[PDB]
Symmetry: D2
Subunit: 474 residues, 4 copies
């Protein structure tokens, strides 16, 4: 264990108060993180706005060089960081190391994407003959101070996915990690500090989101809020933003649509991998199967066999299903499972709970009257909902308040493309599970799944504006 | 003559039980009445739009463009007829009002052709991860859905069409809420789209005073996007009611004209006067404050003065440069700014005079930062000259404004001007010319309280679309 | 009815030459009119006029250049029946198909005007590459290449003239159109529309004449900055020998394969194959010219295709027959020789060969093998071979063994597999479950290998005929 | 000492039965030998490349970029080792030669990252016709195939890497033919790619005598694209052999520096001398004629003279500004241009001297356009000053050249400079700076006899890629 500190203006600062963090799978004390005051928040933001000018006037290639160095340090320390990340969020050890490696990949890719963004030269004579000698030189500029707020389930990857695109464009950044996950966020900050990031260009803030969360968001030093987390918290940020630009990555209830001509064993393989990864604690993850009646019995059997084979255990043993993040999360999941059983759903795999380790539960004959048909569990439970027509599958899929991603399993690709056009989601994966990657692809959600478009180049465009200089050629 | 106007709702023209009478600001002549819609009538507009969306988005781009081209041709045909009423309704010079209609047709046509050739992206998984080299993402644009377009009094046709046409080409459905003062002109624009045969519900209008109906139309869950041009306080309120939904806001401006020691003063004076006093200063992009190096301030002020004195002051029907302001409260607000500036010691190079709401153009010199006129947007024919001692002071005063729409720099050192422009917190910097929204293909955006989002034709199309990514593995 | 003496457009005037070429309708021998037989000195005058006009033309706004193109398109629509009627006779194209060609030409001209007028430049940052250059920016704007020589083909003498002229003109180039001799009347009728639209003198000009007098001369001339050619592979190869350092675009021959897998919709494959293969009697570079069909479905597919080939009408252009007389006797002789080689080597004639004059009835062969000329050579006539293959790998191998690489069709219900096949096909475009085709004209059109060079389709053609001018300075 | 070098052929290092001994132009020192390949050995290079193409083009972008980054890291590691030999081989200053190698690594790394994130596009049939609204075209990038890259003696590593890396990232395979003088440097570059693990046959080298394989290399049917830098007459020969294969040509220049009456004359002189006399004038991009308004010509000429007199003249190992020219014929040619200018009455402001092939830097004033030096590319250290009385005359004289690579304009009036730039028949105009190829992300191209095609990193990648379209109908 150890006492961690926030990065503030190039200096590691403790706070009067602190919060102790324990491993959710064991209760092991992992350390403590500062509990920041509002004056300490003000100082973070003040140093950031002070460093902005010297940072934005650096060349793109100099800013990229800092990001590449930080990524190299993360790769070097992937095992040491991952070992702690695995404990802090009860994620499989290997999966935690992989998250660190993927973060380095995103940081490097953002550095090189951001140093070659488009600038435009527009001709007045495209619109009006009298203006044929007038041209507009349009160049991108940073928005200023970006507040990045990462979630517990990817506390390093979904911090880096915000930090690096912001920094390459010339923004300064403050990272508010989740409390459960704050040690991992501060370990990420260490890599940026060692890389030599100029004082104040990147800073961290730790403290209970339920105490300082509103304060850090409504502070007028913040020019942009980039948030990943729960839908209700995101909704609140959408109000406190006013006219300030934002990005919200919220909940999902991704549907896997399985048509009569699908490869059922292949559909089952992708569905189980996607639904039960990290115990279902992922926004982009198959959370409901909408399967045509004729093949539903066969598909359910294929899924059941796979779910029964999943390992259920501790993070150190790289179990497929690990303990959920906290007791409230496990209670909520158990509640959803109980509601489905009470309303008559068929439990194809057996429920069991030891501490907060819930064994994976597959339900068949789930109906739209059951909470599990709609609510995001963030736990290892998966409903199968039988449908009679493609039209009905589309209707049920779109009736969700969420619209992150969908999967379509079928051998008729032109038809699948037509269905994809009708689904109110950001991304449709054909014959594969839903996923955020690859990280160059757009990542976005409709409806209550959030706002804005991420993926690397899209994230950079979001956290920049344009400056147009217009003049007349003689 | 004075006609009773109706809203376009699901392809039909509909009256309401209550209406609003509209008078010409320059004469008091009654021009007609427009409906005062109920919340239930708004619900019907939105329901018809959402019902029409599926069949509209499934048309080809070229079919949607054909409707817009036909609407634009009708506007050109009726430009004189529409311009004459627009001129009376907002007290805009007759020829300028006809020009607004012609420009609207140009924007509609340009948006139709820009939007039909918007294309998508194919992204390679192998750009990022070797194991994903057979995975590609087919990324195509889609409409956001129902766009609520809210236009302002000063360009009630042009800044309606600048929202409607980009929205429609992309496959969105649209409800237009014009300004009450300007609602007749907005409904005249709607007639063109109806005559072009726009399918029922694809384009609709809503009228009923923003002070009464504005909050309900914005909060309504049917609306997927809000595209607003108007005052900063109204824009802020819309920002709150939008929640997570995308919005575009084009709000107030206090554009600075920075005049350096090496500037051509005759040309700077010409551009400053044209920009500051166009439409009596009732433009968000007007030159609204001169920041001039002291060593050229006396001669610049004198050359501006000579031009201000030559401006005609009269009625819209006579194509006067300075026409009566939109309403009495607007003229009172401008008079108050003039009074404040005079009380604090500014020099009135031209004399204040007011007959009804026709204020003569007032040029002030020696304006200081303690005067309201240095900061607040007047929306009237008054221009302050603020003297600075260094270019750094000009940058600081320019950026101290809460507004950040555009700026002008007058100088003969362009490399230095480019470096100045990089530091100005605005969307667009014009070198050796007045600020202006055009040409309409160029980006138009404002920093700080001047709004959110980027317009100009292609940018407005991109704003009112989202993307749909379809990912698959090649075998 | 009344044959006319036609003239070239040269510097805004209509000019005869001392000698001329009489053009006869291939289907009937009817004298249609004459076009000038220009001398090298007259070519010089065309090019001198063009280079003189280039200054005032490239400096116009995009809006002003676009207006001329839109007006020319409007005139073509107005005169589509009049122009199509003569085009039909000149190249023995069905009357309705010739009118359709004119209408399609107006569509491409209008689309090119609107595509080109909104093209943009870019601004690049020195600091993307080196910190010391962070204040250096490059303002990069588009410019024309100069004088474009556009050479159109007999089989689309209007459409594939307009596909070159309009992209060139919107970008600020000046243009000289050399139509094919058989097709020169149609090209000069197109020129009349641009002249009536008010195209400034010398901005657009025409050249007609004999290859033996001016053929190489028009291409080698130093005034020409770009050559844009559609025609046969051997003529294209010659233009490559004479192009030197100047950019060119070549749209040459094809032998497009239609790969029909076991899981294909065979009725749909047959319908598309026959439409693509026999349109304009097979006188198209983009056209199904060989069926590569998996053994298990070959009998069924052959029967479907046979039925549709038998329904094709064979006759005169005025009667809108599907199969019209070929462009000349040499072309028909060449086609007959390919048919005889296949017959003598044991291919099965599923429909009967007949020839009257240069009117060849449509011939479908089954059991064609790679030792037969018809497996490889582009006929430009109404003959189609079916080649039975055992695997998709063999279909890919045989398809890619061709010296041509224009397009391919894949008929299958497995699209992810079809994409994997398309990646291996050495062609410009692969159509899934559809015949090969140039359209829609916004899509890229290009040929690999001996099928051409460069990428057309509207925006791609404008890109090819534009360069850039960069202005670089340091911000202070 | 002097080593026998080998060609990289299908992952193996191959001598040939005959070789070419390479000597240092400044000293006569034997540097080593390169193989004199036969036509059958060229066949083996090309067969190896075409066999490697299938597995190379189907690797992921990231895998291809990783090889390029590794090659660049090795070049940086070995920059002195390679640069020291490059310096001797082409009589380039030692520091400049090492810097060339470093710049090559920068270009290789930048090309890898530019190329790996290239994208395809999806086009809508409904943009063009309603009946095709369900038809989409998935357009993806593909390599052209085998690129023949021919580097120049004056940048035998940098302008090899500028072709190789853009080709490779896009999935092309490459054969590099260095010039004989400059073949050792080319083979040293190849060693870096081989050590980086470039797969066998993906990158190969050809060396030999023109009399044996010169035309054969270019005419060979395996070659799909020719990318050449060199002299105009040699490039003209390549053009006569390209057939239908796409080419790119970077040929000669006669860049003008136009100096107007308001120019900063000290800045102009500094840039003019740096650009004109770098590498003894043996650069295609380099100020080669000053076109100066007569009112400022005396002062400009004096400022240039003072700088030219400071230039060091001597050996490559001593980083002399002016080193010996590439061979005797080149120096003879330059001496002839100098003599013609002297005999026709130009003023020699600095003195001509020749020792071996080391020519001292010669600045001429009062050059008239009947002098060969006004027009012919010298590739030697001689600079004419031509006085004009109007900008229009400067433009005419500039454009009268058969060359059109770059131009410089020195003036404080940028809107005017931009208008002049529009009229100059060149690829790039630099304002208040010498002409230069960099930064390497910017476009680099020549008009007229200066070449064909657009380079600079992303432009070079575009040039060596084509597309494959897959079109289907949505259901
Ligand atoms: N779409 C995506 O890409 C994505 C990815 C991952 C997760 N998610 C979603 O996020 C949810 C799970 O994440 P979570 O449990 O960490 O969410 P959460 O409880 O909303 O917390 C998210 C983050 O916001 C902070 N926060 C809490 N209250 C705040 C406030 N009032 N103002 C500002 N910030 C505040 C939290 O700090 P504290 O920890 O101190 O409360 C934490 O750092 C699920 O709904 C999941 O679908 C989405
Ligand atoms: N940035 C630009 O591009 C641009 C262009 C033009 C004008 N403007 C700005 O607009 C202002 C002048 O226009 P204006 O006087 O018409 O401004 P405004 O009073 O804000 O009105 C703008 C529009 O919003 C409507 N509205 C009023 N209250 C509303 C509410 N609560 N919710 C929703 N909509 C509501 C108005 O309808 P009613 O008429 O019924 O109240 C009108 O249609 C100036 O500040 C000027 O700078 C900006």
């Amino acid at each position: 264990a150890k006492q961690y500190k926030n990065l503030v203006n190039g200096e590691w600062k403790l706070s009067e108060n602190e919060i102790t963090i324990y491993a959710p799978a064991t209760g092991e004390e992992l350390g403590s993180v500062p509990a920041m005051t509002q004056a300490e928040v003000d100082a973070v933001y003040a140093s950031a706005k002070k460093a902005l000018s010297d940072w934005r006037t650096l060349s793109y290639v100099e800013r990229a060089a800092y990001l590449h160095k930080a990524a190299d340090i993360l790769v070097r320390d992937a095992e040491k960081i991952g070992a702690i990340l695995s404990k802090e969020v009860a994620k499989g050890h290997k999966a935690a190391v992989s998250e660190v490696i993927r973060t380095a990949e995103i940081i490097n890719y953002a550095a090189e994407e951001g140093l070659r963004m488009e600038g435009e030269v527009l001709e007045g004579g495209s619109f009006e003959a009298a203006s044929k000698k007038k041209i507009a030189i349009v160049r991108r500029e940073p928005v200023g101070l970006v507040l990045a707020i990462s979630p517990f389930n990817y506390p390093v990857n979904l911090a880096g996915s915000k930090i690096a695109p912001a920094l390459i464009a010339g923004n300064v950044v403050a990272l508010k990690p989740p409390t459960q996950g704050s040690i991992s966020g501060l370990l990420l900050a260490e890599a940026f500090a060692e890389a030599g990031i100029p004082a104040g260009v990147f800073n961290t803030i730790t403290g209970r989101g339920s105490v300082i969360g509103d304060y850090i968001v409504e502070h007028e030093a913040v020019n942009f809020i980039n948030f990943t987390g729960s839908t209700p918290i995101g909704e609140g940020i959408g109000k406190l933003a006013g006219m300030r630009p934002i990005m919200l990555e919220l909940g999902g209830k991704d549907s896997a649509i399985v048509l009569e001509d699908a490869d059922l064993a292949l559909a089952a393989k992708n569905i189980v991998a996607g639904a039960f990864g990290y115990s279902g604690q992922r926004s982009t993850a198959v959370k409901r199967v909408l399967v045509m009646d004729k093949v539903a019995d066969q598909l359910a059997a294929e899924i059941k066999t796979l779910v029964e084979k999943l390992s259920v255990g501790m993070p150190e043993d790289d179990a497929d299903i690990t303990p959920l993040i906290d007791t409230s999360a496990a209670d909520f999941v158990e509640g959803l499972i109980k509601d489905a059983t009470d309303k008559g759903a068929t439990a194809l795999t057996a429920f069991n709970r030891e501490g907060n380790l819930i064994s994976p539960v597959l339900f068949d004959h789930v109906t739209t009257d059951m909470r599990l048909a709609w609510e995001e569990p963030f736990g290892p439970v998966l409903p199968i909902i039988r449908v009679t027509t493609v039209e009905e599958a589309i209707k049920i899929s779109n009736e969700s308040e969420y619209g992150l991603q969908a999967s379509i399993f079928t051998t008729n690709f032109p038809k699948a493309f037509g269905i994809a056009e009708q689904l109110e989601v950001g991304t449709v994966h054909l014959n594969n599970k839903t996923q955020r990657g690859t990280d160059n692809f757009p990542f976005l959600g409709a409806k209550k799944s959030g706002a804005g478009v991420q993926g690397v180049k899209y994230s950079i465009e979001a956290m920049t504006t344009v400056k147009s200089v217009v003049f007349d050629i003689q």
